[PDB]
Write a protein that binds this DNA or RNA. Structure first.
Ligand SMILES: [K+]
Ligand SMILES: [K+]
Ligand SMILES: [K+]
Ligand SMILES: [K+]
Ligand SMILES: [K+]
Ligand SMILES: [K+]
Ligand SMILES: [K+]
Ligand SMILES: [K+]
Ligand SMILES: [K+]
Ligand SMILES: [K+]
Ligand SMILES: [K+]
Ligand SMILES: [K+]
Ligand SMILES: [K+]
Ligand SMILES: [K+]
Ligand SMILES: [K+]
Ligand SMILES: [K+]
Ligand SMILES: [K+]
Ligand SMILES: [K+]
Ligand SMILES: [K+]
Ligand SMILES: [K+]
Ligand SMILES: [K+]
Ligand SMILES: [K+]
Ligand SMILES: [K+]
Ligand SMILES: [K+]
Ligand SMILES: [K+]
Ligand SMILES: [K+]
Ligand SMILES: [K+]
Ligand SMILES: [K+]
Ligand SMILES: [K+]
Ligand SMILES: [K+]
Ligand SMILES: [K+]
Ligand SMILES: [K+]
Ligand SMILES: [K+]
Ligand SMILES: [K+]
Ligand SMILES: [K+]
Ligand SMILES: [K+]
Ligand SMILES: [K+]
Ligand SMILES: [K+]
Ligand SMILES: [K+]
Ligand SMILES: [K+]
Ligand SMILES: [K+]
Ligand SMILES: [K+]
Ligand SMILES: [K+]
Ligand SMILES: [K+]
Ligand SMILES: [K+]
Ligand SMILES: [K+]
Ligand SMILES: [K+]
Ligand SMILES: [K+]
Ligand SMILES: [Mg+2]
Ligand SMILES: [Mg+2]
Ligand SMILES: [Mg+2]
Ligand SMILES: [Mg+2]
Ligand SMILES: [Mg+2]
Ligand SMILES: [Mg+2]
Ligand SMILES: [Mg+2]
Ligand SMILES: [Mg+2]
Ligand SMILES: [Mg+2]
Ligand SMILES: [Mg+2]
Ligand SMILES: [Mg+2]
Ligand SMILES: [Mg+2]
Ligand SMILES: [Mg+2]
Ligand SMILES: [Mg+2]
Ligand SMILES: [Mg+2]
Ligand SMILES: [Mg+2]
Ligand SMILES: [Mg+2]
Ligand SMILES: [Mg+2]
Ligand SMILES: [Mg+2]
Ligand SMILES: [Mg+2]
Ligand SMILES: [Mg+2]
Ligand SMILES: [Mg+2]
Ligand SMILES: [Mg+2]
Ligand SMILES: [Mg+2]
Ligand SMILES: [Mg+2]
Ligand SMILES: [Mg+2]
Ligand SMILES: [Mg+2]
Ligand SMILES: [Mg+2]
Ligand SMILES: [Mg+2]
Ligand SMILES: [Mg+2]
Ligand SMILES: [Mg+2]
Ligand SMILES: [Mg+2]
Ligand SMILES: [Mg+2]
Ligand SMILES: [Mg+2]
Ligand SMILES: [Mg+2]
Ligand SMILES: [Mg+2]
Ligand SMILES: [Mg+2]
Ligand SMILES: [Mg+2]
Ligand SMILES: [Mg+2]
Ligand SMILES: [Mg+2]
Ligand SMILES: [Mg+2]
Ligand SMILES: [Mg+2]
Ligand SMILES: [Mg+2]
Ligand SMILES: [Mg+2]
Ligand SMILES: [Mg+2]
Ligand SMILES: [Mg+2]
Ligand SMILES: [Mg+2]
Ligand SMILES: [Mg+2]
Ligand SMILES: [Mg+2]
Ligand SMILES: [Mg+2]
Ligand SMILES: [Mg+2]
Ligand SMILES: [Mg+2]
Ligand SMILES: [Mg+2]
Ligand SMILES: [Mg+2]
Ligand SMILES: [Mg+2]
Ligand SMILES: [Mg+2]
Ligand SMILES: [Mg+2]
Ligand SMILES: [Mg+2]
Ligand SMILES: [Mg+2]
Ligand SMILES: [Mg+2]
Ligand SMILES: [Mg+2]
Ligand SMILES: [Mg+2]
Ligand SMILES: [Mg+2]
Ligand SMILES: [Mg+2]
Ligand SMILES: [Mg+2]
Ligand SMILES: [Mg+2]
Ligand SMILES: [Mg+2]
Ligand SMILES: [Mg+2]
Ligand SMILES: [Mg+2]
Ligand SMILES: [Mg+2]
Ligand SMILES: [Mg+2]
Ligand SMILES: [Mg+2]
Ligand SMILES: [Mg+2]
Ligand SMILES: [Mg+2]
Ligand SMILES: [Mg+2]
Ligand SMILES: [Mg+2]
Ligand SMILES: [Mg+2]
Ligand SMILES: [Mg+2]
Ligand SMILES: [Mg+2]
Ligand SMILES: [Mg+2]
Ligand SMILES: [Mg+2]
Ligand SMILES: [Mg+2]
Ligand SMILES: [Mg+2]
Ligand SMILES: [Mg+2]
Ligand SMILES: [Mg+2]
Ligand SMILES: [Mg+2]
Ligand SMILES: [Mg+2]
Ligand SMILES: [Mg+2]
Ligand SMILES: [Mg+2]
Ligand SMILES: [Mg+2]
Ligand SMILES: [Mg+2]
Ligand SMILES: [Mg+2]
Ligand SMILES: [Mg+2]
Ligand SMILES: [Mg+2]
Ligand SMILES: [Mg+2]
Ligand SMILES: [Mg+2]
Ligand SMILES: [Mg+2]
Ligand SMILES: [Mg+2]
Ligand SMILES: [Mg+2]
Ligand SMILES: [Mg+2]
Ligand SMILES: [Mg+2]
Ligand SMILES: [Mg+2]
Ligand SMILES: [Mg+2]
Lengths: 150, 117
RNA sequence: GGUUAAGCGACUAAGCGUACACGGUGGAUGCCCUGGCAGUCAGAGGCGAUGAAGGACGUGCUAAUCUGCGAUAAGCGUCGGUAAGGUGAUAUGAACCGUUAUAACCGGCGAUUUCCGAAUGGGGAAACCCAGUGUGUUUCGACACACUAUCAUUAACUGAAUCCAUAGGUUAAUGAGGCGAACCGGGGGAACUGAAACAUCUAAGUACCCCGAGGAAAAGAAAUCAACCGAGAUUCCCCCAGUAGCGGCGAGCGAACGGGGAGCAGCCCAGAGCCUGAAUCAGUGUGUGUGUUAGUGGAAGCGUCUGGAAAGGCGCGCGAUACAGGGUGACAGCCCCGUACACAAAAAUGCACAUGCUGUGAGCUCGAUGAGUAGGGCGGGACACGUGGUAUCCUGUCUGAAUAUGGGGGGACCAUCCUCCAAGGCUAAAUACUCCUGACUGACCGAUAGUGAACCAGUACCGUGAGGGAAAGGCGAAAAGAACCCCGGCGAGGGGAGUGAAAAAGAACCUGAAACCGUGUACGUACAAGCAGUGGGAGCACAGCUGUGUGACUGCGUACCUUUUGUAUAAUGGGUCAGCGACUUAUAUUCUGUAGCAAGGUUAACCGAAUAGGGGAGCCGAAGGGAAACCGAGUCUUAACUGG
RNA sequence: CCGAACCGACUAAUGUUGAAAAAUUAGCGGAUGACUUGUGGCUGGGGGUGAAAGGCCAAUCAAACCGGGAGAUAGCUGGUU
RNA sequence: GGGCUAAACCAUGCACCGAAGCUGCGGCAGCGACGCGCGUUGUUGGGUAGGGGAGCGUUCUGUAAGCCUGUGAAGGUGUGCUGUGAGGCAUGCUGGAGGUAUCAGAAGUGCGAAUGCUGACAUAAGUAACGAUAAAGCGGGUGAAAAGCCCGCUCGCCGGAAGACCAAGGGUUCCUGUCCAACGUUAAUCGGGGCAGGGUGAGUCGACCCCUAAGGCGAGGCCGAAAGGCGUAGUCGAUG
RNA sequence: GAAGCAACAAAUGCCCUGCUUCCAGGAAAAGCCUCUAAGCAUCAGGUAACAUCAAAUCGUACCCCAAACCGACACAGGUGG
RNA sequence: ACACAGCACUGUGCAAACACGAAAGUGGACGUAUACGGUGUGACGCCUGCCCGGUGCCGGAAGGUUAAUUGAUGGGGUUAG
RNA sequence: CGGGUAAGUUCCGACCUGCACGAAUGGCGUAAUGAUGGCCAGGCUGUCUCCACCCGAGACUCAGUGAAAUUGAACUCGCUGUGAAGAUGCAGUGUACCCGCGGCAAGACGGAAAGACCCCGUGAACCUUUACUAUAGCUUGACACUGAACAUAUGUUCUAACGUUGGCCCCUGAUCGGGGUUGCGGACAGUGUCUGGUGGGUAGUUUGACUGGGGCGGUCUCCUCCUAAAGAG
RNA sequence: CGUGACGGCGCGAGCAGGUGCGAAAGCAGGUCAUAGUGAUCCGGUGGUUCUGAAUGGAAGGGCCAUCGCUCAACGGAUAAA
RNA sequence: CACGAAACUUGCCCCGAGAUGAGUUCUCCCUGACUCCUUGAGAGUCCUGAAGGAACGUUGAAGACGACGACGUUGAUAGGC
């Protein structure tokens, strides 16, 4: 806190409580007793626990019928309207789409659809697999995920 | 995550001051004083749930004594006579009868006198 | 019937209490963000004698302050952008400018740029006082402009004691000085504190003072390590390891070898010949790209309900490489500004190429190979290493080699072997930091918080001075900021009227808590003794026997915190309210719980676009005993164990 | 030497939330001197200055004030929702 | 304490009163058994330092482009209901735009005390005091209002000053008009207060200027780790 | 718009930076006057009279033993001539 | 109480002792032992006795002891043989 | 003991039994002087016996303005007892209708200032010294700057280092500085490094605990008996 | 096995080796017993089938035996008050 | 059954019925109408307004202020005369 180190008033004789610093956290405008510093909040996850959790999540998606496997999933042009129609045909609304290779037209077509995300197999994460209503994987992405998780 | 205390602090102080209604001066207006008064009132009330059972029995006994002596017998002999006659009416009821049914109370006195004779 | 007598007895409230209603004061709370806080990614890493930072005084149709500017004074020229509006804010008005392109506004380049300030013509109590010289000009009063500091270097001319000389003197050219938050190198260098005292030691080469530099600095191409195998300059990160050691062997201090990474680069003089101008850097022109400094286009919505207002509800549509974000009378993809995406430069400038011009020298050969130095004695300092058995480094003092057939090092020292070549120098990258600029982000703050400062704050105010240093945010969607009438002093203040969704939103303005102070009503209270309540309880009032308010009379009953053997204590602390105010954070270590894997478990830095994946350098565990060599399910002890 | 101005400060009362953070009132001492006063200058903190009281050095003095080391340390007291 | 000749004392006896002890009735919890979380059963439940266990609420992140909300959010203020407690729920009035279940996650997470810090407001109390005991009285004027202002007459006080004039220091306080919120220890029509306008005229007064004192700075210079110290030629410096 | 004279008394002001006396023995520099050196030579320069021009700039209000300065105050204080 | 004129002791030969100062310098002093510093005493009058063992100061310097420096002699490590 | 007083722990004069005067940290006298200390007398008085009256400024009442310290909360009596041991608040009892105003200070262990005395803390500061450890200064010697002869480490001589706060000359308009010259010193002096001594001139610190408060005294480890309550302690 | 918070201190049959006395059984690991004492660090001396910073040695260290404290404030703050 | 002291209860002086146990005595004054209601020590309107009190004024050997006393034209309360 900005200020001087001068003792506000003498130790004895004035009839006031003793003061030492204008910056005392007891005082208005004083310091914060245990002032925060920037923190690193990240945790360690064991490699085998990360992979174990992914296998648990994918297995539960299958049991709950939230994993949909298709041979192919693509659009002809980078047009949001085309992907919206495709998803409406398959009765999908809030969906994560996992492809083997990131189709450039598909990625652009999904940007402005806020309930829809498009990833490659190497970029799946545990929170996304739980957060979306459905998960659509191409047959190619399924193999890549199988190999990735052994 | 800074937490301001005002809304919760106000509710707590208001809860105590509501329990202090009717008290005199700062005791119904000033939190520091009202809190002490609410605690002391709670201590007294705990103590006086026990005292209440003592004071009422003491009152019933005094009234039975008066009614028994109107009928020519002391309280202590009356109670002993009822116990020898196997009468199990308690003092709350004996005091009620002593006030509201003087004829029935006389009958109880006669029952006690017979068991003592 | 009356009179008398005796007994009993309501209606009083000066004031006070409790409850409720309605207000005042006051500014909590909630909601709010043109202010802060912490970062990430980029940029820029300086400004100044061509006069800085920072100021003084001016400058408008202008009285003040803010912002801008400088006697050409909210501005002038020019080249570009852009345009239907404009002449900065307070802040209306006045006088005006402009609408198809010299209005304004934005950007490049120019012009102007008072005085003080390094301040530089001399002086000086900063923003003032006083000159010299030379060019001009003059109406003879005078006027304008330019020069004139110091020091360093270089050159010319001159020039003592003193003969040559040298010192000295004059002039010219070129440079320097001052300011700035951190980072960097160097010269100096505390104490509190810890050691439960204290002196060695620690704190600590820290704080602080000083000098100097750069965009980074420093360091750097082995007289280095290693261990008989090899490595191959410097710097930075993770290990090694809280190990080896140091240590009033106390408190504490604390490596290296070796390993994994980031980054990678080598050269020159101590000199001649040949061959020559050949590499390579620096400068200056010119091109081509690529940024930076203004900008251009940029999709798609209506009806109806509630309402002061629709962006909300309901219905039916449409755009999306655009559902980032902000605004609009409540919450808007389609109203507005943007956003994705696609384009743009007359001029100045950064970068990377290219190509000129200038300087620089490339190669081969043959040589050479840093002396008051290495080493030593004495005194100190630095090395994790405190003189210790103490190598090595620096040097204040006194000394002093060999010089390649030679010398340094390998932790006292010697021999052997290995390895390197001091006493000359240059060198990018990986690294450090952020006064400053742009963009973006936050389980950061939201007016006692966050900067001291959300507001004209380093201000008001305090101090001789260095220096110290506040408080203070919110009407409404829009000022529609209340015409007019009335009381009043042509007041203050108020009542009407009107505006508005709302005026107990009226500027002392959102919400409007509490302490504190009132008016009204109900009940109690003037024969009654104490923590003021609690248990019992009559009467009265009120609303529907009960609920609410009050509480005569009566049993019991000496606040709270702290500190103590023990407190009603006449021990401590608190006038009251509201707001704030105290076991945290990082790393290491051990134990418990829980999860994964299991005789195994797990990676660090780093790589990677990656919360993935790679990376097993390492760390812990599966073996102990012994001081150790060493041995090993045993081992140590002892000559040896009945043994321990 | 006596005594005003001027420079002092021996006694008493008042005052003591003062008229005043040292005064007022009545008396008191020096008053051509080691006198007094204006303006300007010089001495700086383990230092100054001192006809010496540890006096004075900006209402501060057995080591000034301001900023920093700095959140010194506190086996003590208080407080801890 | 009243009072007591027993209402004192001794002895014997039988009654009764008397505690949060024991019993009765209803309820909650800990621990252990016994059976299938439940039942049954036994037993326990005063507590400072302190250990262990289990929870409430607050702000923020996700879930949440969800859900509630102008047919009224947060906050404020009442009332009713509800749980063993921290608390929870509903709703009238006020308010006028936000709020947020659940299950998880993180903490500037809870105040009555620290002669705590900041602001607000009490008490004493309508009390002390209104700043030299030089002193006032009256008539007239102005004004909403006059003890205090203006005019007049009288009275009193200073007169080596309580008069006049400079330097220093201050900086518009000066004069005129106008106003009376705040300032003035009362009122105020008055003011050193607010606002507006006006006002400072030099060859001779002063400064600047020439000249020096104490002292300061100081080209070169001498000295010093650096910063700097001293000082020559000089150049400043009035109080002359 | 009259008178607008005299006598006497009289400073701490003036003559006096004097005079007398004493010891503690009482600034400096310029303006001013004068002397020449280098130099200049019927030139410049000097002296006098006369004429003519110039003398800039800044301060100037007001308080000043105080209600305007130093004392937080419209403060019984302090403030040199 | 301090100071004081007076008194005494003592230092000081001038580049004085002494003091401020890493130093250059400066004060002492443009003074020179009839002077300057330090210390005690305190006008004046009459005076100021005995003790040199202790502590200090002054002088002495033959002997004992003793620093840096010097490195005789002895002992050890290493190994050509 | 004498004097003074009716009465004199003071005063004055003596005595000497000086607890514990004494000769320049001066002895004994001393005219004059002193807002200096003690004692006595005349005058004088409200100092007092012993107070009375009066004049003014407050206090008191009215109008205007308008503070303060303090404060857990108060429905805030006496007495005797009790009790953290001195009670408005407890017990018993007595007395007491509600509320101002002027007065007085016995109590609220009244207000004021985290007791200054005392003790404690392995707190502080400043002062002292023959406390400890250092150190500026002063002083000693060795080596360096530092040389030549001769005689016997010492002595004599020399000049050329070095000193000069002697004269003269120049830079120069200069009591600084520098250079030149001359004289005087002269290998001395002085300075650097090393070294012995001295060193409250200055600095950093230490200076125990137990204890019927602390200090002073005593004690501090070990052995035996008793206290010790028939095991141990 | 006793006794201590601990550091420690004490009693002890018996086993191996070697010994003295006794014909022998046996007794002897000091003394009728209980006081006669001082941790650690730092070093000294002797020994040693340990270690030996490139290697052989050596220095130094370890291990075994032993020495230095009225550290008596006797669990001993420092070498030094 | 009787004497017996400044102590006790009276006698003397003053206060005194808040003596809530609020006492006594003497004297004076008031002798209307109506309505409503929840029907009783009820509320209201009209008429009435006594004895006496208070207020105001002039005042006091009464007095801080209150209080107390005298007097107010049918009058000596104060001032004047
Ligand atoms: K605070
Ligand atoms: K998307
Ligand atoms: K009442
Ligand atoms: K309030
Ligand atoms: K200048
Ligand atoms: K220290
Ligand atoms: K300590
Ligand atoms: K200490
Ligand atoms: K929008
Ligand atoms: K060494
Ligand atoms: K601040
Ligand atoms: K602030
Ligand atoms: K409102
Ligand atoms: K309000
Ligand atoms: K009661
Ligand atoms: K307390
Ligand atoms: K205590
Ligand atoms: K105590
Ligand atoms: K106390
Ligand atoms: K002093
Ligand atoms: K000061
Ligand atoms: K000091
Ligand atoms: K609400
Ligand atoms: K508090
Ligand atoms: K009041
Ligand atoms: K005043
Ligand atoms: K008035
Ligand atoms: K004037
Ligand atoms: K004195
Ligand atoms: K004499
Ligand atoms: K004499
Ligand atoms: K002697
Ligand atoms: K002697
Ligand atoms: K002496
Ligand atoms: K005197
Ligand atoms: K009582
Ligand atoms: K009192
Ligand atoms: K101690
Ligand atoms: K002190
Ligand atoms: K010499
Ligand atoms: K000393
Ligand atoms: K004792
Ligand atoms: K005692
Ligand atoms: K025993
Ligand atoms: K090695
Ligand atoms: K001890
Ligand atoms: K009566
Ligand atoms: K009369
Ligand atoms: Mg300080
Ligand atoms: Mg803050
Ligand atoms: Mg990983
Ligand atoms: Mg927040
Ligand atoms: Mg609370
Ligand atoms: Mg209240
Ligand atoms: Mg209330
Ligand atoms: Mg200048
Ligand atoms: Mg200039
Ligand atoms: Mg000048
Ligand atoms: Mg310590
Ligand atoms: Mg470099
Ligand atoms: Mg658009
Ligand atoms: Mg709609
Ligand atoms: Mg709204
Ligand atoms: Mg070499
Ligand atoms: Mg070497
Ligand atoms: Mg060397
Ligand atoms: Mg070597
Ligand atoms: Mg070696
Ligand atoms: Mg703030
Ligand atoms: Mg707020
Ligand atoms: Mg100021
Ligand atoms: Mg709003
Ligand atoms: Mg409001
Ligand atoms: Mg009574
Ligand atoms: Mg009553
Ligand atoms: Mg009472
Ligand atoms: Mg009671
Ligand atoms: Mg006690
Ligand atoms: Mg008690
Ligand atoms: Mg007590
Ligand atoms: Mg009390
Ligand atoms: Mg108390
Ligand atoms: Mg306390
Ligand atoms: Mg205390
Ligand atoms: Mg205490
Ligand atoms: Mg208190
Ligand atoms: Mg092992
Ligand atoms: Mg004086
Ligand atoms: Mg006199
Ligand atoms: Mg200092
Ligand atoms: Mg003293
Ligand atoms: Mg002072
Ligand atoms: Mg000190
Ligand atoms: Mg520190
Ligand atoms: Mg502190
Ligand atoms: Mg019971
Ligand atoms: Mg029970
Ligand atoms: Mg129990
Ligand atoms: Mg319990
Ligand atoms: Mg949320
Ligand atoms: Mg919220
Ligand atoms: Mg949530
Ligand atoms: Mg908190
Ligand atoms: Mg609070
Ligand atoms: Mg508490
Ligand atoms: Mg207080
Ligand atoms: Mg009043
Ligand atoms: Mg009072
Ligand atoms: Mg009064
Ligand atoms: Mg008064
Ligand atoms: Mg007055
Ligand atoms: Mg007047
Ligand atoms: Mg003004
Ligand atoms: Mg005026
Ligand atoms: Mg005026
Ligand atoms: Mg007024
Ligand atoms: Mg004015
Ligand atoms: Mg100088
Ligand atoms: Mg110079
Ligand atoms: Mg001059
Ligand atoms: Mg002058
Ligand atoms: Mg005179
Ligand atoms: Mg004037
Ligand atoms: Mg006045
Ligand atoms: Mg005054
Ligand atoms: Mg001299
Ligand atoms: Mg003397
Ligand atoms: Mg006598
Ligand atoms: Mg005598
Ligand atoms: Mg004597
Ligand atoms: Mg003598
Ligand atoms: Mg003597
Ligand atoms: Mg003597
Ligand atoms: Mg004497
Ligand atoms: Mg005198
Ligand atoms: Mg008592
Ligand atoms: Mg009094
Ligand atoms: Mg007190
Ligand atoms: Mg205390
Ligand atoms: Mg000392
Ligand atoms: Mg002790
Ligand atoms: Mg002793
Ligand atoms: Mg025993
Ligand atoms: Mg026993
Ligand atoms: Mg024997
Ligand atoms: Mg024996
Ligand atoms: Mg040692
Ligand atoms: Mg070796
Ligand atoms: Mg001990
Ligand atoms: Mg008599
Ligand atoms: Mg009276």
């Amino acid at each position: 806190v900005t200020g001087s180190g001068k003792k506000p008033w003498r130790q004895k004789g004035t009839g006031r409580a003793r003061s030492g610093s204008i910056k005392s956290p007891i005082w208005r405008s004083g310091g914060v007793t245990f002032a925060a510093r920037p923190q690193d909040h990240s945790q360690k996850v064991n490699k085998k626990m990360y992979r174990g959790a992914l296998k648990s999540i994918l297995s539960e998606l299958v049991r709950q019928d939230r994993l949909i496997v298709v041979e192919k999933f693509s659009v002809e042009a980078p047009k949001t309207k085309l992907l919206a129609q495709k998803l409406k045909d398959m009765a999908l609304e809030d969906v994560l789409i996992i492809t083997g290779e990131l189709d450039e037209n598909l990625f652009l077509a999904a940007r402005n659809l806020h309930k829809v995300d498009v990833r490659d197999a190497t970029g799946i994460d545990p929170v996304s697999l739980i957060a979306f209503d459905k998960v659509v994987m191409t047959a190619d992405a399924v193999k890549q995920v199988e190999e990735m998780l052994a | 995550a800074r937490v301001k205390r005002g809304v919760i602090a106000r509710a707590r102080h208001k809860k105590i001051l509501k329990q202090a209604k009717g008290y005199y001066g700062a005791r119904s207006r000033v939190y520091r004083v009202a809190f002490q008064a609410v605690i002391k009132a709670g201590q007294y009330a705990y103590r006086d749930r026990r005292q209440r059972k003592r004071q009422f029995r003491q009152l019933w006994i005094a009234r039975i004594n008066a009614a028994a002596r109107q009928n020519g017998i002391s309280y202590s002999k009356f109670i002993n006579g009822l116990k020898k006659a196997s009468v199990e009416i308690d003092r709350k009821i004996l005091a009620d009868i002593a006030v509201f049914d003087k004829v029935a109370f006389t009958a109880l006195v006669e029952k006690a006198k017979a068991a003592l004779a």
